[PDB]
């Protein structure tokens, strides 16, 4: 069982209190994987924002099947004092070998203005197309399968 994630940095704007980005999850192995077994983590510094809410903009199987929770990290490291963990509900479906979700655009919103230039998972060089951003991590059943942590 293996997966990859590809990533495009959001438009930039506009609104300084919104992190926007789009990911695509691909099954690169030889067996089907249920979406409900997959987690994606986006690692960042919340910059004093105590509240950080996740919103899913669009997903092919429905935005009501994408869940996000944002958690503070106890032992913070450079580039991450907070991560957003994206997961799927049991009815999101499954990815056959070679299958991919296509674009899932999302946003993380705060009450104050983020500085995305000190966020580990941010890569401003991937604005114009999807790239392989290995500063975003992904898991199958809680085992790391893509990217490099923290
Ligand atoms: Ca930050």
Automatic annotation (TrEMBL):
Coiled coil: none annotated. Ca(2+) binds at residues 45, 47, 115, 118-119. Residues 1-149 form the CBM3 domain. The lineage of its organism: Bacteria, Bacillati, Bacillota, Clostridia, Eubacteriales. This is Glycoside hydrolase family 9. It comes from Acetivibrio thermocellus (strain ATCC 27405 / DSM 1237 / JCM 9322 / NBRC 103400 / NCIMB 10682 / NRRL B-4536 / VPI 7372) (Clostridium thermocellum).
